[PDB]
Amino acid sequence: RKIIDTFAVLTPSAVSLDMRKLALGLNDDSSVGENTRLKVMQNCFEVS
Amino acid sequence: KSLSLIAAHSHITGLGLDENLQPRPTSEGMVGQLQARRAAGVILKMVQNGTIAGRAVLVAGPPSTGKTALAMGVSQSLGKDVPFTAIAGSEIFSLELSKTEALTQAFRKSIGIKIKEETELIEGEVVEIQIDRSITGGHKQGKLTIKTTDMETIYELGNKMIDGLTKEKVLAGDVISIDKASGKITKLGRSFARSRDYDAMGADTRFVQCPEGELQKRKTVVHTVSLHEIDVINSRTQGFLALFTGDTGEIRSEVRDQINTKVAEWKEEGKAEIVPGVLFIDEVHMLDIECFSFINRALEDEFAPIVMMATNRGVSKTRGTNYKSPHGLPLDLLDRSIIITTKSYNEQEIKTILSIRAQEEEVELSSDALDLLTKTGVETSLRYSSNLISVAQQIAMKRKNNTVEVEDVKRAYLLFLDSARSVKYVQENESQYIDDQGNVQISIAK
Amino acid sequence: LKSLSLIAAHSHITGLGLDENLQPRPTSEGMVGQLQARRAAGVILKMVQNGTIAGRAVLVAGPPSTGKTALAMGVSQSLGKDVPFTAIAGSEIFSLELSKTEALTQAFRKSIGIKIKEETELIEGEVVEIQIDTGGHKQGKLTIKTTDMETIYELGNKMIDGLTKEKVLAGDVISIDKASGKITKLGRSFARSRDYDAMGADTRFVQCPEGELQKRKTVVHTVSLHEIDVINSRTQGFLALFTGDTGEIRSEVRDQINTKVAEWKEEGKAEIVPGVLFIDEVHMLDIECFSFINRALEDEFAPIVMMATNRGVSKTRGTNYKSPHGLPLDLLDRSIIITTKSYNEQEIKTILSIRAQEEEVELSSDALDLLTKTGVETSLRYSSNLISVAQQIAMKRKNNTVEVEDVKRAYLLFLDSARSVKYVQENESQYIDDQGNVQISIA
Amino acid sequence: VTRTAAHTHIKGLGLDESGVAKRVEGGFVGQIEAREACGVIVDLIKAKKMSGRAILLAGGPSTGKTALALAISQELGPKVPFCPLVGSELYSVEVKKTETLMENFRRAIGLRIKETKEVYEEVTELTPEENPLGGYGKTISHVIVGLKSAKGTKTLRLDPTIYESIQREKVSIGDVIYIEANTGAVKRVGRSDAYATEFDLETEEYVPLPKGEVHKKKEIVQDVTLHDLDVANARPQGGQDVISMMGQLLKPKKTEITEKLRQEVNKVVAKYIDQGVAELIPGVLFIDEVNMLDIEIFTYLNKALESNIAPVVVLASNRGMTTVRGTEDVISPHGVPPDLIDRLLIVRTLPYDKDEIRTIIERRATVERLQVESSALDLLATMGTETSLRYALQLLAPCGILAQTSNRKEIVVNDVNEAKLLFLDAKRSTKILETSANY
Amino acid sequence: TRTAAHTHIKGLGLDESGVAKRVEGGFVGQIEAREACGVIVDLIKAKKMSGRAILLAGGPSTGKTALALAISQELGPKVPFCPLVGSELYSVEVKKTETLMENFRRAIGLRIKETKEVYEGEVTELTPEVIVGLKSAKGTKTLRLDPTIYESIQREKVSIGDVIYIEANTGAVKRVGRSDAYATEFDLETEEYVPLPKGEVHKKKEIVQDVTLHDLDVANARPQGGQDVISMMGQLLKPKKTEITEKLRQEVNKVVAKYIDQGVAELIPGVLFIDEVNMLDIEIFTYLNKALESNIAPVVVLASNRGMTTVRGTEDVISPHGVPPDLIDRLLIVRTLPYDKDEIRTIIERRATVERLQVESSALDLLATMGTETSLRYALQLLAPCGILAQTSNRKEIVVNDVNEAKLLFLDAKRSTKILETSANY
Ligand SMILES: Nc1ncnc2c1ncn2[C@@H]1O[C@H](COP(=O)(O)OP(=O)(O)O)[C@@H](O)[C@H]1O
Ligand SMILES: Nc1ncnc2c1ncn2[C@@H]1O[C@H](COP(=O)(O)OP(=O)(O)O)[C@@H](O)[C@H]1O
Ligand SMILES: Nc1ncnc2c1ncn2[C@@H]1O[C@H](COP(=O)(O)OP(=O)(O)O)[C@@H](O)[C@H]1O
Ligand SMILES: Nc1ncnc2c1ncn2[C@@H]1O[C@H](COP(=O)(O)OP(=O)(O)O)[C@@H](O)[C@H]1O
Ligand SMILES: [Mg+2]
Ligand SMILES: [Mg+2]
Ligand SMILES: [Mg+2]
Ligand SMILES: [Mg+2]
C-alpha cells in the first residue's frame, strides 16, 4: 500500500465516453444478447 | 471539414476532359500527356459503363510522368457515390492480417453495395410527453402530442418508447426521427406550435427549427457500406468495435460465400444496388510472386474490380523471385494485363504547373523568380523547383518584401544542395563521412 | 468400413498375419513375395507384442510403391485394436507452436498404451414416492421400490435435507450412492411418458432396472497419459483435449507422470500396452531430429520406430556434408535394414487383378497382360489408375469387361512419364524457364 | 446490371453418351482429347465409386485450364462441393499449411443430412397451477397454455421447462410463439395482431398472425460438410455467465484439428447414415499455380494421396523443366517431382487456332452484347494468333467504349487501332524500356 | 546538477535577418547548416504549408544532432519536436507503417478547450436500487449513480464521514478520505481527515487540457474512464495499441475538423526527427515514398551520412547517405563541413566552461592539438577525466602531466588498432 499510494499521480490524457459500456455488452442498446445485462451489473456490483 | 491545409497533391480538383474522351491541354491543373488523359477518359467511361471486370493496366515508363497526377485526376473526375481504394502496396504486410487476408479485404472493399431501407418517421412538435401508468385494461395510456406545422395531432406510446425519448435526457417538443425497427428515438432539439399562449407579455425564448414535412411519410433511406462492415458483423455479434479499433481478426471463407449468395439474391430481389468500383495499387515491381498468382487467378475470376497498377521502375528486380524482368513483372502477368507508357515532360508545362501552384498559394511572384525556378527545375526535376518556390517565398518574407525576387531563388539554390551537387560533394569526401567500412578520418591534421 | 471409408490403394492387404510357422509363402492375404522381409517383419511384430523390451529400431529402404506404407498398415492391422497407431508424416513436425523435439516426445507419449480400472457403487431402481408427515423433515424416511426389494430407507441430516434437494415428484427411477454419495436422476418412467405430451429435453423415460439396487460396478479405461497431461495442465483443462493448445509440455509433468504410472503398475491398478511409431520418408527431416532420436530411443519408455526412406547418397537436412541415404551414420548404426526389390511380371499381374477385385472391376486376359506390361516398363501405379479409367470407359461403352479397347484409349489419352518428358523437351518453346523465358509469340 | 469477367460464356463440356464432342457448344471450341478425358473423369466422379484420384495437365497460360475447371465444376451441379483455391493461399499464418490441406480435404467431402421436427404456436388462454410430497416448498410441473394459431386452437400442457420457456420469451396472453417440441424452448415469432393496437405506437413488431394449424410438423434436408461440424463443436454455443459472453466477444483463431476428433466425427456420421439420415457424396479439389509449392508438400502428398477418404484432386502446372520451389537439385517437368508423378497421369492442354480464336472473339462480343465487324474481328483474331488472344479480349471492351463515344454500335478498324495506340502490350514493351534514363 | 554533452547549446543566435553569430549559444562555424536551419525555422514559423522534408548531411561531431536540439529549443515549449531513430520504427505488436502514422498523428499539436467538472463533498446517504449525497462546504446534493459507477462507489468503502473526488464528465470516482469534521472518532485514527470541499459539490472549471491526434484516437479506440470497474474491464480487454485503420482516420478527421471549427480550438504543426536512415530497409523507404505524397504528413528532418554504400533492404542500390535514389531526388540536401583547428579550440573552451572547468591557455591549446591530431571526440571526452585527474593529483589547473596520463590511459581507436596488429591472441 505504501508502494502503491503516493506515486499514483499520472493521468492518461484523452478519454471518449460511451466506449466501455459499448464494449462490455451491458447498456440500453447492444447487438449482443440482453439476457445477461441485469446479472452482469449485479456481478459488477459484487465481483471482487 | 476534411482538415488538410495544403499539399503537393492538393492542386487538382476534378481533372478536365470532354464528351469526346479527348485530353485538355490545361485540364484543371494537370497539363500535357494527351495519351494519359485520353486513357483516363476511356477508363472513366469504362467504369461508368459498369459492364467489364478483371482488367489490369500498367502505367509504365520513367517515373515523375504524372502517374500520381493521373490517378488523382481520375479519382476527382469520376465523382461521388463511388468510393475508391488508393493505397500503395508497401503496407500490405501487417501483424494482424495475412497477405491473403489483406488482398481479400482490399478486393471486397473495392466492390460496394448500396442498400435502400423503407424506414418510417413521426415528425412534428411533440408539445407534451405524458406517461400514464400501466393500467390493466389499457397497458399504456401514454399521451404525446406530435404535430407539425401542417396539422395538430396527438399520439400514444406502447409501453416501449418512453425510454426511447430519454435514452439521453431530453425534454418534449423535440422533433423525433423515430424508426419502428430501431427502438432508439432520435430527438432533433426544439420545435414550434401555432399558438400565441397567454394574454400578458410572453412568447419569450422561442427561436428554433419548426417541423416542415408531413406528420408521417415513408423514407427509403439509402446507406452505403463495404463488404468489410458486413463481414465483421458476420464474424462477431458486435462489429462496430472492430470497425473502429481495427481488430477484425481474419474472417473465414464460408462467411464470404454466404455473403456472395445473399448479395446475389438481394440484387435479384430489387433491394440492393451493386456498385463495382475499381482498385488502385502502387509499386507492382516490388510485389511478390504469391501476390502475382493471387491476381492472376483473380483476373480469371468472375468477380474482379478493374486494376490501376503501376511500376515506376523499369526493368527492375522482381521482388519475391530470383529473376528480373521488364517492369519488375514476369511475362505471364505482363501479357495478361495491358500497358500504357508514360514519357517525361518539357520545360513549358513545368512553368505552367508551377504558376498554377503559385496562384494556388496566393503569392505575388515576380516573373524573374519564376524563370529562375523554371531553369532550376528543368535542369534537375520538377519537385526541385516545386520546393524552391516555397523556400524562395520564405526568403522573400525574411528580407521584408512581398514580391519573390531573384535573390530569394539564388539564396534557396545556394543554401540547399542538388542531387548532382550532393553526389559530387560526397565523391570528393570518400574518407570524411561514414563509408562502407565506416572509416571516418576525423583527424584533420597529423 | 465402419467409418465413411470408401477404398484404399491397398485395402486388400489388412494384416501381416504370418502363419504359425512364420515361413513366408509365395502368396498370402493378397501379398506376394517379400519373403525374408515378411519374416523379419513378423519377428519385429512379435518383439513389439512382447511388451517387455523397449528401445528397438528397424529401418526400411527401397524404391517406393513397393507396399512400404502398406507394409506398416498391415503390421498395424495384425497388431489388432486397443493399440493406437501414430499417423504422423515427415512434414508434420515443423509445427509453429510445437517444436520438433517435444512434438516427437508428444508423439511417443501418444504411442504408449496403458490400462486403468476403477470401482464405484450405486443404487438402482429407486421408484421412491416420498410421503412424510411444513418443512423440517420430521420422521425423514423415504419409501424405495425397485424390482427386488421394496422397503423404507431411514435418512439423516444430509439426506432429510438432501431429498428436498433435487426437487422431484418421486415417480421415477433415481440413483443414490450407498457409499455416502449424492443423488442423480437417470430418467422418468413409462407412466411419465404419457402424462406430458411433449416431454422436455431433460425428461427421459427409462424402465425400472430388473434386479436389485446395491450395484458395485467396475469400470475399465484405456487413456494415454498425454491425455491426462492435457487434463491436468490447468485448473479446468478439459476444453484443451481437442482444440490442440497443449503448449510444449514441460518435462516435470512428464517425470511426475512416469513416477505415477510406475507406482500404479506396482500397485496393479495399471498395466502397459506396447506402442509403435512410424513416419514415412525420414530423409526429408532435419539432422536435429536424427540427433535427438539417437539419444531418445534408448530411454526406459522407448517404443520402436518404423524408419523408412528411399533416397540415395545426399545431405542430411540441417547440414552440408554428403551423407549415407541422406541419414547420419549414428542413425544408420543403431537399427536394422529392410529393403525392397524390383517388381516381376507375376506379382504385377496378380496385384493388378486383386486391385480390380477391390475396385469391383473385371479385367480380361488382354487388358491384364497389357497393363502388366505397362506396370513393368513403368510402375504399377500407372496401371492401377488405368484399370479404373478403363472400367469407366467400359461402363460408358455399354460393357463391363476391360480389354484392348479401353486400355488403348487410355494409353492414347493418358501420357507415360518418359514420353511426357520427351514431349516437354521437344515443345519447350511453349514452356517457361526460371527467368520467365516464354515464347508467347506463335507466328 | 450485368458483369461478365472472362467467363459466363461457358456452360458445359458439351458431350454425349458415346464421348462425342461438339465443335462449338457450351462455350468450348476444339480440344477433342481434353473434352473426352474430362467427360470420362466426371463420369467416373458421378458414380461416387472411388477416392483420391489425381491428374496433371500441361497447359500454358490462356490455353484453357481455368475454363475446363469451371466447366467440370458446373458438370457436377451446384450441390456437389468444390473448393478451388489459389496455390499461394496454402502458406497461412495462424495454422500450419499441412493442417490447412487436411482441412480442405475435410471440407471437400460432402454429405446430405435431414431431420423431421414438430412445433406449436397466439395464446388462447392460460391456467397455471404437483406436490412436494416431502419437505420441499412446492412442486410446479404443469401449466395449461393456450395456442391460437390460425387454423384451429389446441391448448396443451407439457413439462414445466416449457413454462419457464414461456416466461423466458416474456410473451403476454396475446403473444404468438413458435415452440419446437424437440427441445421445449421458445422461438419468438413476435407479438400478435388480435390483441394488438393497444396503443398508437409500438416499436415491437405487431407481426402477422401465424398461418395454419398449430400442431405444425415438417421435415428439413440440408447438405452440410464435416468441417462446419468441427468448427461448431470447437466453440461453445450457449452459456449465461461471464465465460460465454467473453468467449463469444473473443475472436477465435484458426487452429489444428486433432485426429481423435476425426475419429469421433466419422463414428457419429456413420451412426447417422446407418439410420438413413444422411447420404454420401465425395468431393472435388483443384489447385492452380502448383509449381510454386515446396518439396515438403510435394513429398507429403505422396502419402496424402493414400488417404482413404481423400476426394478426387486435379493438379495443374504450366511450367516445364523447373526446380521445385526450394529445391537445390530437384528439377522436374512442370515443377513436380518424379516420385509424385509416379502416382498420376498426364494430359496436354494446347493453345487454340485461327477459326477457333476468331469464334472465341465473336462469342465474347456476343456475351458482351456488342456487334463486331468482319474486318475488325479478323484483325483482332490475327494479331491474337501472332502474339496473344487476351490482347484482343481486353481490347474488345475499350473498343466498344470508343464506338459508343463515336455513337456507333460496331467496332471499325479505326477503333481497334486507336485502342492499340492508346494501350500497348507486352511485345511493344519488350523493346522500349531499355532506352529509359529514369527507371 | 548533471550535464550530458548538451544544454550548452541555447539557440542558433539568428539576428533580425536570420543570421547567427560565430560562437553564440553553443555554436561553432557551419554557417551553411545554421542558415538552412534558420530558413526552415522561418518556414515553420509561417505555419501555412506542410508536407516537406530535408536531410542534413555531415560527418561525426559535425553538429547535425546539435543543430536538431538547437532548432528544438528554438521552437519553444508548446510546439513539439519528435525525436525518433530508425530502430524505433521496429515495433512489436503493430506494423511499422502504423507506428509511423501514430508518430505523425501525435506530432501535430492541437490546442483545444474541453470542459471538466468534479463532484466533491461529504456523503450523506446512499440508496441502493443510486444516491451519493455529497456535502461540500456550502452545498449538499445527491447525484444518481449508474449501476457501474454505483459498484465503483461500493468498492470505495465510502460511508458517512467520507469525501470523494468523483469527476463529472469522465465519471470516475476518487475518494478524498474520511471527513476532517469527524476528527473526534479516534485519537489514532488510521484514515486521513480531509474537510468538506469548498464551493458547491458540482465544481466547474474552464480547462486548457489540449489533445494530440493520437490522444483522441486512443480516447475512443481504448477508452480510459479509469477508476470505475467497467472502465477497468475496458482498459483490460484491450490495454494495448490496436491497428487503427483509415476509416477511423476519416472519422477522427471529421471530429477534429468540427472541434476546430467550434472556434476555441486551433492547430499547430510539429517537427519529427530521424537519425541514420542508412540502416532503414527498402520497405519503409518505399512506403514513405508514397506516404509523403499526401496532405497531412507533417515536417520531418533526416540526419544521415554514408558514401557509396548499398542501401539497407537491398543489395544493389548504391547511393550517398544510404538513401534510395528516389528519396534523394525528392528531398533537400543541407551541407555540413568538417570542423577546423580554431573550431576545435572554441569547442573545447566552451565545453570546459559549461563543465565548470577553468582550463588555462596552454592546456586548452594542447587539448586542441589532440583534437586536431586524432579526432574531436577523443579530445572532448578527456575534459572531465583530466580535471578529475588533476583533482586527484592536487592541481586546480591541468598541467601537461594530466593530459599525458590521459593519453597513455584512455587510448583512441588509432592506438588500439596499432596494438591490434601485434598480438598472439585477439
Ligand atoms: N502533369 C502534371 N500536372 C500537374 N502536376 C503534376 C503533373 N505531373 C506531376 N505533377 C506533380 O507531381 C506530383 C506527382 O508526381 P508524379 O509526376 O505523378 O510522379 P510519378 O509519375 O513517378 O508518380 C503531384 O503532387 C503533382 O502535383
Ligand atoms: N504384395 C502386394 N500385394 C498386393 N498389392 C500390393 C503389394 N505390394 C504393393 N501393392 C500395391 O502397390 C501399392 C504400394 O504403395 P506403397 O508402397 O504403400 O506407397 P509408398 O511407397 O508411398 O509407401 C499399394 O497401393 C498396393 O495396392
Ligand atoms: N477452348 C476455348 N474456348 C472458348 N474460350 C476459351 C477456350 N480456352 C480459353 N478460353 C477463354 O480464355 C480465357 C482465359 O483463359 P485462361 O484461364 O487464361 O486459360 P489457362 O487457364 O490455360 O491459362 C478464359 O476466360 C476462357 O473463357
Ligand atoms: N556548433 C556546435 N556548438 C557546440 N557543440 C557542438 C556543435 N556541434 C557539435 N557539437 C557537439 O558535438 C557533439 C556531436 O554533435 P551532434 O550534432 O550531437 O552529432 P554529430 O554532429 O556527430 O552528428 C555533440 O555532443 C555536441 O555537443
Ligand atoms: Mg509522383
Ligand atoms: Mg492463372
Ligand atoms: Mg509411401
Ligand atoms: Mg549531428
Curated annotation (Swiss-Prot), chain A:
Highest taxon, organism lineage: Eukaryota
Residue ranges the record marks as coiled coil: none
Localization of this protein: Nucleus
Miscellaneous: Present with 656 molecules/cell in log phase SD medium.
Assembly and interaction partners: Component of the SWR1 chromatin-remodeling complex composed of at least ACT1, ARP4, RVB1, RVB2, ARP6, YAF9, VPS71, VPS72, SWC3, SWC4, SWC5, SWC7 and SWR1, and perhaps BDF1.
Function field: Catalytic component of the SWR1 complex which mediates the ATP-dependent exchange of histone H2A for the H2A variant HZT1 leading to transcriptional regulation of selected genes by chromatin remodeling.
Family designation: Belongs to the SNF2/RAD54 helicase family. SWR1 subfamily.
Name assigned to this protein: Helicase SWR1
Species: Saccharomyces cerevisiae (strain ATCC 204508 / S288c)
Curated annotation (Swiss-Prot), chain B:
Keyword Nucleus: yes
Swiss-Prot/TrEMBL keywords: Activator, ATP-binding, Chromatin regulator, DNA damage, DNA repair, Helicase, Hydrolase, Nucleotide-binding, Nucleus, rRNA processing, Transcription, Transcription regulation
Any single GO BP term: regulation of DNA-templated transcription
Primary localization class, coarse: nucleus
Binding of ATP, residues: G61, P62, P63, S64, T65, G66, K67, T68
Any one Gene Ontology cellular component term annotated for this protein: Swr1 complex
Subunit structure: Probably forms a homohexamer. Interacts with RVB1 and may form heterododecamers with RVB1. Component of the SWR1 chromatin remodeling complex composed of at least ACT1, ARP4, RVB1, RVB2, ARP6, YAF9, VPS71, VPS72, SWC3, SWC4, SWC5, SWC7 and SWR1, and perhaps BDF1. Component of the chromatin-remodeling INO80 complex, at least composed of ARP4, ARP5, ARP8, RVB1, RVB2, TAF14, NHP10, IES1, IES3, IES4, IES6, ACT1, IES2, IES5 and INO80. Also belongs to the R2TP complex composed of at least RVB1, RVB2, TAH1 and PIH1. Interacts with SPT15/TBP.
Stated family: Belongs to the RuvB family.
Miscellaneous comment text of the record: Present with 3030 molecules/cell in log phase SD medium.
Identification of the protein by name: RuvB-like protein 2
Organism (species): Saccharomyces cerevisiae (strain ATCC 204508 / S288c) (Baker's yeast)
From Swiss-Prot, chain C:
Alphabetically ordered keywords of this record: Activator, ATP-binding, Chromatin regulator, DNA damage, DNA repair, Helicase, Hydrolase, Nucleotide-binding, Nucleus, rRNA processing, Transcription, Transcription regulation
Source taxon at top rank: Eukaryota
UniProt-listed SUPFAM superfamilies: P-loop containing nucleoside triphosphate hydrolases
Subunit structure: Probably forms a homohexamer. Interacts with RVB1 and may form heterododecamers with RVB1. Component of the SWR1 chromatin remodeling complex composed of at least ACT1, ARP4, RVB1, RVB2, ARP6, YAF9, VPS71, VPS72, SWC3, SWC4, SWC5, SWC7 and SWR1, and perhaps BDF1. Component of the chromatin-remodeling INO80 complex, at least composed of ARP4, ARP5, ARP8, RVB1, RVB2, TAF14, NHP10, IES1, IES3, IES4, IES6, ACT1, IES2, IES5 and INO80. Also belongs to the R2TP complex composed of at least RVB1, RVB2, TAH1 and PIH1. Interacts with SPT15/TBP.
GO terms, biological process: box C/D snoRNP assembly; chromatin remodeling; DNA repair; protein stabilization; regulation of DNA-templated transcription; regulation of transcription by RNA polymerase II; rRNA processing
Keyword set includes Transcription: yes
InterPro entries, per database record: AAA+_ATPase (IPR003593), P-loop_NTPase (IPR027417), RuvB-like (IPR027238), RuvB-like_C (IPR041048), RuvBL1/2_DNA/RNA_bd_dom (IPR042487), TIP49_P-loop (IPR010339)
Residues bound to ATP: G62, P63, P64, S65, T66, G67, K68, T69
Stated name of the protein: RuvB-like protein 2
Swiss-Prot record, chain E:
Record-listed ATP binding positions: G58, G59, P60, S61, T62, G63, K64, T65
SMART domains: AAA (SM00382)
Gene3D superfamilies listed in its UniProt record: 1.10.8.60, P-loop containing nucleotide triphosphate hydrolases, RuvB-like helicase, domain II
Reactions mediated catalytically: ATP + H2O = ADP + phosphate + H(+)
EC numbers on record: 3.6.4.12
Keyword Transcription (UniProt): yes
Keyword set includes Transcription: yes
First-listed, main subcellular location of the protein, grouped into a coarse class: nucleus
Single GO biological process annotation from the record: protein stabilization
Cited SUPFAM superfamilies: P-loop containing nucleoside triphosphate hydrolases (SSF52540)
Record's subcellular location: Nucleus
Quaternary structure and interacting proteins, as annotated: Probably forms a homohexamer. Interacts with RVB2 and may form heterododecamers with RVB2. Component of the SWR1 chromatin remodeling complex composed of at least ACT1, ARP4, RVB1, RVB2, ARP6, YAF9, VPS71, VPS72, SWC3, SWC4, SWC5, SWC7 and SWR1, and perhaps BDF1. Component of the chromatin-remodeling INO80 complex, at least composed of ARP4, ARP5, ARP8, RVB1, RVB2, TAF14, NHP10, IES1, IES3, IES4, IES6, ACT1, IES2, IES5 and INO80. Component of the R2TP complex composed of at least RVB1, RVB2, TAH1 and PIH1. Interacts with SPT15/TBP and HSP90.
Similarity comment: Belongs to the RuvB family.
Note from the entry: Present with 11600 molecules/cell in log phase SD medium.
Protein name: RuvB-like protein 1
